């Protein structure tokens, strides 16, 4: 409410950061507090991979070396937030940052450290619209397919991804079987990426509470 | 490969063209014969949706109207060649054409008519390298995962797709379960499109033989 719990949470992640390593870094206000923590040890870290322009400019300014995903075989950790997280640590992500870059850095990372306030934990994924990046010539097609799956896809007009793709935000779904829905949407021709992190979810969850953050991994 | 067999196959596809329809049209030498055929019936069709720059030029030469995929809700047919086709009518496609375009136009069309000479049928897919379009920052990652699936991914250097993505051509696979492999690749973060046409394959195969066109419905 309370990006004091956002900050508790973000600094709480610093314990996962090893001397000599390259750190995977997401974005958000709660990650940006983790980047404030991380600069506290700029000297002891080899560098960072980031899924966000804002974070990388911030890491650079702290003098932390930036690596390209194609320069690493893996990352020890990826520290990011989520839009929703369920009891099984499956997430909706990409509602407010670079969906495809987040999914790719999280894929290369050994451990995903999810960093949230009290509002992210849910029963059933899906209240928060599910972002789906779509090749532009396919947008009406993919949208027909999401309707068949019982979603209500809404095109995010006036913007594109760095790649030039469009975003559909899918409302109204009760996402029981996230792994299955991830499968289903990844199968639709014209889909680039789907904001269900269900086959690879959070490994540690750190939730900001009033008394200083809850490491409920 | 014989051009007269390509020619026979492309002309035979013309029987499948309903008057007053918008025709899905692919690319290649075999399809160029089909386009010739379609010329003979042009003032009898509303238009065409094409997956190829060169096919659009040819259809425009004939005065056939061009529609985009977002302008139609379905297509009756899509007429295209293939790199390889198994006896189950599953194809490798995209080796020398616009892979993502073709898979989306085929997803929209009701009926896929695959027009081939005798050199496209194979017992098992995989000799012909499988094209995978990939987000550039994900290239090494996706190649690591393709190697885990048994393949030899080769980066198609010097070039990008319309969308700015890279292509990995994957050698050395014995694609005994095309629907599974499509599912597996479709789920690697960073994959945009896989040249496996397995869940949605060909509905009609017209093969050009030394005798004439042979139709397999």
Curated annotation (Swiss-Prot), chains A, B:
Q: Which GO terms describe its cellular component?
A: cytosol
Which stretches are transmembrane?
none
For this protein, the record's Pfam families field holds: Rib_5-P_isom_A (PF06026)
- Its top-level enzyme class, in one word, is isomerase
Q: Tell me which domain of life the UniProt entry assigns to the organism this sequence originates from.
A: Bacteria
Keywords attached to this Swiss-Prot or TrEMBL record, sorted alphabetically, are: Isomerase
EC number, as in UniProt: 5.3.1.6
Q: Name one GO biological process term.
A: pentose-phosphate shunt, non-oxidative branch
Pathway where this protein functions: Carbohydrate degradation; pentose phosphate pathway; D-ribose 5-phosphate from D-ribulose 5-phosphate (non-oxidative stage): step 1/1
The UniProt entry's coiled-coil ranges are none
What's its catalytic activity? aldehydo-D-ribose 5-phosphate = D-ribulose 5-phosphate
Which residues are substrate-binding? 6, 27-30, 80-83, 93-96, 120
Q: Which InterPro entries match?
A: NagB/RpiA_transferase-like, Ribose5P_isomerase_typA_subgr, Ribose5P_isomerase_type_A
Catalytic site? 102 (proton acceptor)
What GO molecular function terms would the record report? ribose-5-phosphate isomerase activity
Sum up the protein's function in the record's words: Catalyzes the reversible conversion of ribose-5-phosphate to ribulose 5-phosphate.
NCBIfam families (UniProt xref) = PRK00702.1, rpiA
In the record, the note on similarity to other proteins reads: Belongs to the ribose 5-phosphate isomerase family.
Q: How does it assemble?
A: Homodimer.
Entry protein name: Ribose-5-phosphate isomerase A
Record the organism. Vibrio vulnificus (strain YJ016)
What does UniProt list as this organism's lineage? Bacteria, Pseudomonadati, Pseudomonadota, Gammaproteobacteria, Vibrionales
Question: Which gene name belongs to this protein?
Answer: rpiA
């Amino acid at each position: 409410t309370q990006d004091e719990m956002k900050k508790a949470a973000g600094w709480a992640a610093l314990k996962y950061v090893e001397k000599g390593s390259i750190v995977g870094v997401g974005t958000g206000s709660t990650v940006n507090h983790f980047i404030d923590a991380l600069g506290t040890m700029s000297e002891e870290i080899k560098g960072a991979v980031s899924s966000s322009v804002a974070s990388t400019e911030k890491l650079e300014a702290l003098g932390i070396k930036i690596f390209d995903c194609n320069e690493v075989a893996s990352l020890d950790i990826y520290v990011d937030g989520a839009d929703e997280i369920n009891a099984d640590r499956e997430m909706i992500k990409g509602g407010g940052a670079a969906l495809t870059r987040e999914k790719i850095v999280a894929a290369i990372a050994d451990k995903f450290i999810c960093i949230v306030d009290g509002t992210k934990a849910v029963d059933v994924l899906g209240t928060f619209p599910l972002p789906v990046e779509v090749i532009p010539m396919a947008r009406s097609y993919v949208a027909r397919q999401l309707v068949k799956l019982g979603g209500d896809p809404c095109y995010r007009e006036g913007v594109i991804t760095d790649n030039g793709n469009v975003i559909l935000d899918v409302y109204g779904m009760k996402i029981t079987n996230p792994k299955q829905l991830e499968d289903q949407i990844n199968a639709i021709p014209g889909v680039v990426t789907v904001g269900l992190f269900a086959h690879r979810g959070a490994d540690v969850v750190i939730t900001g509470t009033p008394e200083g953050a809850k490491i409920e991994e």
